[PDB]
Design a protein around this motif. Structure first.
Motif, short mmCIF file in Angstrom:
data_model
loop_
_atom_site.label_atom_id
_atom_site.label_comp_id
_atom_site.label_asym_id
_atom_site.label_seq_id
_atom_site.Cartn_x
_atom_site.Cartn_y
_atom_site.Cartn_z
N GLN A 58 34.22 31.13 37.49
CA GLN A 58 33.49 30.46 38.56
C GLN A 58 33.21 31.39 39.73
O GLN A 58 32.13 31.34 40.34
CB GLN A 58 34.29 29.26 39.04
N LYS A 59 34.20 32.20 40.10
CA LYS A 59 34.01 33.15 41.17
C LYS A 59 32.99 34.22 40.81
O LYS A 59 32.14 34.57 41.64
CB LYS A 59 35.36 33.76 41.55
N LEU A 60 33.05 34.75 39.57
CA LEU A 60 32.08 35.77 39.15
C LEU A 60 30.66 35.20 39.14
O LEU A 60 29.71 35.88 39.53
CB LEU A 60 32.41 36.31 37.76
N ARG A 61 30.49 33.97 38.66
CA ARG A 61 29.16 33.36 38.66
C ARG A 61 28.61 33.27 40.06
O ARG A 61 27.43 33.58 40.30
CB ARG A 61 29.23 31.97 38.04
N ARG A 62 29.45 32.85 41.01
CA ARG A 62 28.95 32.70 42.36
C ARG A 62 28.58 34.05 42.97
O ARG A 62 27.55 34.17 43.64
CB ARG A 62 29.97 32.00 43.23
N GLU A 63 29.41 35.08 42.77
CA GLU A 63 29.09 36.40 43.33
C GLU A 63 27.84 37.00 42.69
O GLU A 63 27.20 37.86 43.31
CB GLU A 63 30.27 37.36 43.16
N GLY A 64 27.46 36.57 41.50
CA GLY A 64 26.30 37.11 40.82
C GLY A 64 26.50 38.42 40.06
O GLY A 64 25.52 39.13 39.85
N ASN A 65 27.72 38.73 39.61
CA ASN A 65 28.05 40.02 39.00
C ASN A 65 27.73 39.97 37.51
O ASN A 65 28.52 39.48 36.70
CB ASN A 65 29.51 40.34 39.26
N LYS A 66 26.56 40.50 37.11
CA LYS A 66 26.04 40.20 35.78
C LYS A 66 26.87 40.86 34.68
O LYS A 66 27.22 40.21 33.69
CB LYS A 66 24.58 40.63 35.67
N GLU A 67 27.17 42.15 34.83
CA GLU A 67 27.97 42.84 33.82
C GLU A 67 29.30 42.12 33.60
O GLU A 67 29.69 41.87 32.47
CB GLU A 67 28.21 44.29 34.23
N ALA A 68 30.00 41.79 34.69
CA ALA A 68 31.30 41.13 34.57
C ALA A 68 31.17 39.76 33.95
O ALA A 68 32.03 39.33 33.18
CB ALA A 68 31.96 41.04 35.94
N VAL A 69 30.11 39.03 34.29
CA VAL A 69 29.93 37.71 33.72
C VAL A 69 29.74 37.82 32.21
O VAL A 69 30.36 37.09 31.44
CB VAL A 69 28.75 36.99 34.40
N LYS A 114 41.39 43.43 20.96
CA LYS A 114 40.01 43.29 21.44
C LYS A 114 39.96 42.64 22.82
O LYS A 114 39.19 43.07 23.70
CB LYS A 114 39.15 42.50 20.45
N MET A 115 40.78 41.62 23.06
CA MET A 115 40.81 41.02 24.38
C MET A 115 41.24 42.04 25.43
O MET A 115 40.68 42.09 26.53
CB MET A 115 41.74 39.82 24.38
N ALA A 116 42.22 42.87 25.11
CA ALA A 116 42.69 43.82 26.11
C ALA A 116 41.59 44.81 26.45
O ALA A 116 41.41 45.15 27.62
CB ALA A 116 43.95 44.53 25.60
N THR A 117 40.81 45.25 25.45
CA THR A 117 39.68 46.13 25.71
C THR A 117 38.64 45.48 26.61
O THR A 117 38.04 46.14 27.47
CB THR A 117 39.03 46.52 24.40
N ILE A 118 38.38 44.19 26.40
CA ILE A 118 37.42 43.49 27.23
C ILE A 118 37.95 43.42 28.66
O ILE A 118 37.23 43.71 29.62
CB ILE A 118 37.12 42.10 26.65
N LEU A 119 39.24 43.10 28.82
CA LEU A 119 39.82 42.99 30.16
C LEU A 119 39.76 44.31 30.90
O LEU A 119 39.50 44.34 32.10
CB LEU A 119 41.26 42.49 30.10
N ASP A 120 40.01 45.43 30.20
CA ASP A 120 39.82 46.72 30.86
C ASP A 120 38.37 46.90 31.31
O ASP A 120 38.11 47.45 32.39
CB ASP A 120 40.25 47.85 29.93
N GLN A 121 37.41 46.45 30.51
CA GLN A 121 36.02 46.58 30.91
C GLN A 121 35.70 45.68 32.11
O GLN A 121 34.97 46.07 33.01
CB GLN A 121 35.11 46.26 29.73
N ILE A 122 36.27 44.47 32.14
CA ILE A 122 36.05 43.61 33.30
C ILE A 122 36.63 44.25 34.54
O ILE A 122 35.99 44.26 35.60
CB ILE A 122 36.64 42.21 33.05
N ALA A 123 37.84 44.80 34.44
CA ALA A 123 38.49 45.39 35.62
C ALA A 123 37.65 46.48 36.24
O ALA A 123 37.72 46.71 37.46
CB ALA A 123 39.85 45.96 35.26
N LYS A 124 36.87 47.20 35.42
CA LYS A 124 35.99 48.26 35.87
C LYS A 124 34.63 47.76 36.32
O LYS A 124 33.88 48.51 36.94
CB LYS A 124 35.83 49.29 34.75
N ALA A 125 34.29 46.51 36.04
CA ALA A 125 33.00 45.97 36.45
C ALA A 125 33.08 45.10 37.68
O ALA A 125 32.03 44.75 38.22
CB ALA A 125 32.37 45.16 35.31
N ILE A 126 34.27 44.69 38.12
CA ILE A 126 34.40 43.87 39.32
C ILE A 126 34.61 44.74 40.55
O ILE A 126 34.44 44.27 41.68
CB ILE A 126 35.52 42.82 39.19
#
Length: 126
Positions: A58-69, A114-126
């Motif tokens: 919900q927070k990412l949607r509001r901020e508009g962060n497309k990669e992270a979303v 695979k989830m851990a890899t995604i979470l590392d990618q999110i951490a770098k996109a926020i």
């Protein structure tokens, strides 16, 4: 904030991974008493994480962060679809089917990775 929600979710993730690893070791030792306890805790951690993921999304949607979303969509889809494996794991425990239990444990570990890899990618996109 996005960053507080992410870190709290990451700490729940880390706890679930650690419980999962502990459970794998207990299962290798045949300690069904301990596996039962860790399965119960893993379920509760699943729920906590689901709450934190939705709060983050919900927070990412509001901020508009497309990669992270987009990445969060992949994480949440894997997390939701992954429940079918977790339910199979629980069933195999309740039926005494150790061969199925082992199989789902090792398959679930691949999803966790695979989830851990995604979470590392999110951490770098926020």
């Amino acid at each position: 904030s996005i960053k507080s929600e992410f870190a709290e979710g990451a700490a729940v993730f880390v706890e679930g991974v650690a419980v999962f690893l502990t459970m794998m070791a207990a299962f290798q030792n045949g300690d069904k008493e301990a596996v039962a306890q860790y399965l119960a805790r893993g379920a509760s951690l699943y729920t906590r994480h689901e709450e934190l993921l939705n709060r983050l999304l919900q927070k990412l949607r509001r901020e508009g962060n497309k990669e992270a979303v987009t990445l969060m969509n992949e994480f949440t889809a894997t997390f939701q679809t992954g429940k079918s494996l977790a339910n199979a794991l629980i069933a195999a425990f309740k039926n005494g089917d150790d061969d199925s239990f082992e199989s789902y444990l090792q398959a679930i570990w691949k999803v966790i990775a695979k989830m851990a890899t995604i979470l590392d990618q999110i951490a770098k996109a926020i």
